[PDB]
Design an enzyme around this catalytic site. Sequence first.
Site, short mmCIF file in Angstrom:
data_model
loop_
_atom_site.label_atom_id
_atom_site.label_comp_id
_atom_site.label_asym_id
_atom_site.label_seq_id
_atom_site.Cartn_x
_atom_site.Cartn_y
_atom_site.Cartn_z
CD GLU A 1 -3.13 -0.84 0.27
OE1 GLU A 1 -3.25 0.41 -0.23
OE2 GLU A 1 -3.99 -1.70 0.12
CG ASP B 1 -9.00 7.41 -0.91
OD1 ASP B 1 -9.82 8.16 -1.38
OD2 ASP B 1 -9.31 6.32 -0.23
#
EC number: 3.2.1.17
Length: 164
Positions: free
Chosen positions: A11, A20
């Site tokens: 990640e 995000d």
Amino acid sequence: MNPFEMLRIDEGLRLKIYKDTEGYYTIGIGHLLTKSPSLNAAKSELDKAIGRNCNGVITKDEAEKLFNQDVDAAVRGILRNAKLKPVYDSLDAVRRCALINMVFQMGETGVAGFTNSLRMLQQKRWDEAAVNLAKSRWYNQTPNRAKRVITTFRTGTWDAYKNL
């Protein structure tokens, strides 16, 4: 290897508030903070979450802890999942680890959609299963990360991440 380093690679790690793909404020290793537009609110949620005057930035360890509470939460869900539960139980500790990786990456819903593939894992049919998962849209989508996860399953070792 260990699970944090796994996700570190997969990640990525972020020590400063960020947005995000969906716009959500996040921090560390995918730790979503809140869904409202406000930085103000994330900031506040973080401070809280972490327990002090962070100001939009945390430490490495401060992140591991957040990361730890999130694995915890994922496991818990897994066990409440009826499609996921049985699979998870069938799995030795490290592959359990790959399943959290996936979940982490695509949600519980997405994971439980790999019907045949789960069956295969459950049955402890480590190669076919390897083969199989390489056929998905998952593999085209995020190839590197998919490859690593697959080796994890194949072998039941940290081979794919250890030199990393």
